[PDB]
Amino acid sequence: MKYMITSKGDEKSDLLRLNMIAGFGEYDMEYDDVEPEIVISIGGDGTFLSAFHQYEERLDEIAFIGIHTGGFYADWRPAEADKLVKLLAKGEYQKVSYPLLKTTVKYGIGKKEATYLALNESTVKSSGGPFVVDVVINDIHFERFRGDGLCMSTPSGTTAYNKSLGGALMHPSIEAMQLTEMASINNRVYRTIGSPLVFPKHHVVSLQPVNDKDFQISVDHLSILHRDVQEIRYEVSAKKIHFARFRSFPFWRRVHDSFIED
Amino acid sequence: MKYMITSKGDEKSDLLRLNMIAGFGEYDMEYDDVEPEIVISIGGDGTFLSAFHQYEERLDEIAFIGIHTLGFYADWRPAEADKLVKLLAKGEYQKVSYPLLKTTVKYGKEATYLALNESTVKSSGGPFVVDVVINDIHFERFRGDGLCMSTPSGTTAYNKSLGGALMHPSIEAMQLTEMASINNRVYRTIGSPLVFPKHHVVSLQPVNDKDFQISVDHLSILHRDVQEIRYEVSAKKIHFARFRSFPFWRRVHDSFIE
Amino acid sequence: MKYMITSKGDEKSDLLRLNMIAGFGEYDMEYDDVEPEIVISIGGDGTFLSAFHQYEERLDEIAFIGIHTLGFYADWRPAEADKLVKLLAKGEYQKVSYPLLKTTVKYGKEATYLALNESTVKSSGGPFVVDVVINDIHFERFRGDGLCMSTPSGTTAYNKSLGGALMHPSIEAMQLTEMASINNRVYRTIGSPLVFPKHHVVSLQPVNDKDFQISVDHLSILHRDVQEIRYEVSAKKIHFARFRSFPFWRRVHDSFIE
Amino acid sequence: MKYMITSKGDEKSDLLRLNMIAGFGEYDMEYDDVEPEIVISIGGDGTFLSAFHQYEERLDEIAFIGIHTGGFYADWRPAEADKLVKLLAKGEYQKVSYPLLKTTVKYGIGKKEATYLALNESTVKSSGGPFVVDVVINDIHFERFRGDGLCMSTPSGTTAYNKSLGGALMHPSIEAMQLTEMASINNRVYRTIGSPLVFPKHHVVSLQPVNDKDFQISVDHLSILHRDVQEIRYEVSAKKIHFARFRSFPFWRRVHDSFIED
C-alpha cells in the first residue's frame, strides 16, 4: 500500500527512515506523503503524536506504526526495522483501534467553534491569573472549579499526564474519557469533587468560563491560546486511531514495562 | 405481582413498610418474600446492600427499589411512599441495569460472591503481601494494607475514599485501588488506580500468609487457606425499577458537592 | 505612633480606611506611609500579601494588622474597626511572629525575595527539569510541572492544594511540594512533601532550560538565565499586633471545616 | 561501658552478635542485659524497634546503635562489625537525639491511663466496624473524623507508614508530630481536613470516641486492643532516643538511599 515515515530529526532516526524506504522500494511499495495508508513514526511518543496530528484528517484511512528511538505508542525496536518492512509488505498485520477525545472550543462574538482531536489528552489553564470554570455534564451543573486547570484524557492517555495528576489507568477498550483536577482549591466557599471522573461514550462535558474568558488549551504536545472562550466541549470522538499490530503486546504489559520494574 | 419489603428496623422504617403493604393490598400485588419480582428497601444504603445480598440467587428475576429514611441507592423519599405504591401498581416504570463484581475465592470447593459496592482484601493481622496477576501477566507484587475492587456504582463509596475515580454505571468495568502501599527502593507498586474491562480477570495470589480478611460490600469474614482471589465483571446485573429521571452524575453532585 | 492603612480599593474598603484615619486623628497617632510602625490592611489575603511586600525592607520595624472585607491573615472584621482604633491607640496588643521563606535567584547580581505564603518554580513553556540539591546532597532530579516551597502559614494556601501538610506557624521550617511529577521506569521523584528545618538550604539547579517562571506569593515573573534558586528559612520574621486569642488551628478549622 | 546486643533470630545475626561479644570481651567491656548503656541491634528496622521498646524505661541512659542484616535506623553494615567494636571501645562517638511521640490511652470506669512511647508512629483503628472520633487539638474541637483510622508519626517515623498515607517527610531536628488520615469519608454530611497536620512540641491532640469505645491501637510494631476508651492523647514526648554516631549519614541522604535510585 501507500506509506510514509516521519522522523524525529536526529541522525539515527533519519537513517533508519531512509533504510526503511530503501527496503520498502525493494517490495514495490509506494511512498505517498499526501494520502498514505500506513504511517510509520520513528522517534518517541512526542514524535508519534506529531505524526498522529499530521494526519488527523485521514484517521479512517491510516494505520499507524511506531518505532521507538528514544515509547508508549511504539511496538518495534530499531533492530527490527527490516523485519517490519517484510511483514508489512506481506500484509501480515491486524488493525486495532483506540478511542480518541473530541475537543470543541467556542469563542468570540462570531461563536466560532474549533474542533481538535487528542490522543493523550486536552488540558485547560488560564491566561496567568485565576482559573474558574463551571463544569457542565450534559444538562447538569456539576461544579464550579477553581484551581490551576483541568485535564481530560483518553484511555491510552491515562498513562501520561493523567497519571501524574492522580487519575486512573483505563484499558483502551473502554470508550471513555477521564477528567482530573489540577490543584483545586477546597475550603468552605469553594468545593470540587476532588476525585477523577470517567465519562462514557455518550456524555458531553462543557467547561464554561465564569469571569475572564482567555484560556491556554493544550492538545497533546500542542498548547494554543484562545481568547473570549464561551465553552470548551469534551466528548469521546466518533473517530478512532488505527494501529497495525503484528504480535501480542497487551496494554497492561505495556503499563507494566513502563512503570513497574523487576 | 409478587413483592416484598425489607426495613432498616427502626420504628419509622417498620411503620412505613406496614403502611405500604396496606396500600399494595388494594391492588393485584401479592406479598411473597420467597419469590418476589419487586423488592423494596426502606432505610439506608446499608439496608439496600443487605437486601441485594439477601436475593443474590435471583437477581435475574427481581427489580430493586430503594426508599431512603445518605441514600445513594435510594430513589424515593419516605413522604412519597404512597405515590410509589400507585405508580408501581400501575407498572409505570422502566428497568435500568447496573454492573456487578464477581469475586471468586479458591482454597487448597470455590466460593463465589457478587458485589454491588466493592470487595476488599486485607491481612489477618500481619504483613499483607500478594501478587497481582492480570490475565496472563504478573503485573506487580503488592505490599500494603490491602486492595479494593469496586463496581462502577461502588466507585463513589469506599473506592472514592481511597483516591479512585468515579465511573458512570453505564461502563461495564471494575476499578482496583491500593490501600497504603509501600514504595521504597525495592518494593514498587503502580500507585495509580486501575480500571479493567468486562473481559479481564484480576487474580490475587498469596506470597506468604494464606489467610485474608475478605470483604464484600458490608460483609467481612476471615478466609483461611486462600489460594487465590479472582475479580472480574460479573455477567450478572442488578435491576432497578426506575420511575423518574435521576441521572448518575446528578446523584454524585447531590451527595458530595451541594 | 506612626501608622498607615492600605485598602483593597473597592468603595467599602476605601471608606473604612478614611473612617479609621479620622479616628486615629483623636490620638497621638501619626499617619506616615514612609516609616510606619503599624501597617493596617483592609481587604483580603491578596491585599495583605501586597502590604507585606510593599514593606519587606522594614519588616523588623513594622507590626501588621489585617482587617477582612476568605481572610486567613485578617484578625478583624470591618464592623469592629472603631474598636481596633481605640485598642491600638491604647497599646493593648502583644506581638506575634511568623517565619518567612528566603528565596534567592542567582544568574550568570543575585536577587533575593522574602515570601509569606510560598515560592513556586515552573517552566517558561517547555519541559521543566531541575536538579534538587539539599545542602550537600543531590537528592533527586525533578521532572514535572513545577515545585512549591511554602512557609508554615502558607501551608494552608497553595501547598494545601498540592497535597502538602499544614504546619503550625511556631515551627521555623519550609515545606517543598511537587507539581504533577513524572514517575515512570526511569524518572523518579520522592513524591512525598518535604519539611526542612531552619538550617537547611534547598537549591534548584537547571538541567536543560535556564528560564523559569518564578513566583513569590501573588507575584509571578519570567526569570531568564537562571543559574540557581535557593530556598531557606529566612532569618527575618513578620510581626503581627495581636489583641485577642485566635489560635492557628482555630483559623484552619474556620477556613476549611465549618 | 555496659552494653547488650539484641539479635533478629536468624543464624547470621546471632553469630555476628556472639562475634561482637567476643570482640567486646577483648576490650574489657561488660555485657549487661539489665542496665546497659549502649544497646546494639542486629537485624532490621523491626528488630531495632524491638530493642527500643525493650528499653523504653532507660532511654535517658542508653545510646542505641543498629547493624542492618535485612534498615532505616541502621548505620552499620555487618562487615563493619569489628570496626564498630573498636570505635565503641575507644569512645570515638557523638550522641544524637531524635524526638519521640507520647501516646496516652484513658479507658474504663477506673479511668486508667496507659502511656506508650513510639519511635515510628501510633495508629488508631476501630474494632471492625465504623471508626468515628472527635479530634480535639488543645481546647479546639477540630473535626469529627470518620474513616479507617488515624496515624500519628514522629519525625523519623514520617518515612514509614506516614509516607504510605500521603504524609510529609520531616527532618528529625523538628520536634513535632504529624497526623495523617486513613481513608476518610468526605461528602456533605461528613467532612475532614484531608490534609496531614504537623503539631509543635507544646500541642496535645486528643482523640475522643463518639459511639463505640473499642479501638485497636498500634505502637510501632505492636498492636493492642483497648476497650471502653475515653481518650487517646498524642503529644511530642519529653524523652528522646539517643543514637551513638561515629560518622556523617545525614537524614535526607538516608531518605535518598531508601527511596531514590540512580
Ligand SMILES: Nc1ncnc2c1ncn2[C@@H]1O[C@H](CN2CC#Cc3nc4c(N)ncnc4n3[C@@H]3O[C@H](CNS(=O)(=O)CCNC(=O)C2)[C@@H](O)[C@H]3O)[C@@H](O)[C@H]1O
Ligand atoms: N507533568 C507531566 N506528567 C506526565 N506526562 C506529562 C506531563 N506533562 C505533559 N505530559 C505528557 O506529555 C505529552 C506531550 N509530550 C509527548 C509525550 C508523551 C507520552 N505519552 C505517553 C502515554 N500515553 N503514556 C505514557 N507515557 C507517555 N509519554 C511519555 O511522557 C514523556 C513526555 N512528557 S515530558 O517529557 O515530561 C514533557 C512534555 N513532553 C512533550 O512536550 C511531548 C515521555 O517520556 C513520553 O514517552 C502530553 O500529551 C502529556 O500527556
Ligand SMILES: Nc1ncnc2c1ncn2[C@@H]1O[C@H](CN2CC#Cc3nc4c(N)ncnc4n3[C@@H]3O[C@H](CNS(=O)(=O)CCNC(=O)C2)[C@@H](O)[C@H]3O)[C@@H](O)[C@H]1O
Ligand atoms: N472508609 C470508608 N470510606 C468510605 N466508604 C467506606 C469506608 N469503609 C467502608 N465503606 C463502604 O461502606 C459500605 C458498607 N456500608 C453501607 C454503605 C454504603 C454506601 N454505598 C455507597 C455508594 N455506592 N456510593 C456512595 N455512598 C455510599 N455509601 C454510604 O457510605 C456510608 C457508609 N460508610 S460508613 O458508615 O462510614 C462505615 C461503613 N458502613 C457500613 O458498615 C455499611 C453511608 O453514608 C452510605 O450511605 C461498603 O460497601 C464500603 O463501600
Ligand SMILES: Nc1ncnc2c1ncn2[C@@H]1O[C@H](CN2CC#Cc3nc4c(N)ncnc4n3[C@@H]3O[C@H](CNS(=O)(=O)CCNC(=O)C2)[C@@H](O)[C@H]3O)[C@@H](O)[C@H]1O
Ligand atoms: N491553585 C491554588 N490553590 C490554592 N491556593 C493557590 C492556588 N494558586 C495560587 N494560590 C495562592 O494564592 C496566593 C495569592 N493570592 C492571595 C492569597 C491568598 C491566601 N493565602 C492563604 C493562606 N496562607 N492560607 C489560607 N488561605 C489563603 N489564601 C486564600 O487563597 C485564595 C486566593 N487564591 S485564588 O483566588 O483561588 C487564585 C490565586 N489568588 C491570587 O491571585 C492572590 C483566597 O481565598 C485567599 O483568601 C498565593 O500566595 C498562593 O499561595
Ligand SMILES: Nc1ncnc2c1ncn2[C@@H]1O[C@H](CN2CC#Cc3nc4c(N)ncnc4n3[C@@H]3O[C@H](CNS(=O)(=O)CCNC(=O)C2)[C@@H](O)[C@H]3O)[C@@H](O)[C@H]1O
Ligand atoms: N502500609 C505500610 N506502609 C509503610 N510502612 C508501614 C506500613 N504498615 C506498617 N508500616 C511500618 O511498619 C512498622 C513496623 N515494622 C517495623 C518497621 C519498619 C520501618 N521503619 C521505617 C522508617 N522509620 N522509615 C522507613 N522505612 C521504615 N521501615 C521499613 O518498613 C518495612 C516494615 N513494614 S512492612 O514490612 O511493610 C509491615 C509492617 N512490619 C512490621 O510488622 C514491623 C521494612 O521494609 C522496614 O525497613 C510500623 O512502625 C510502620 O511505620
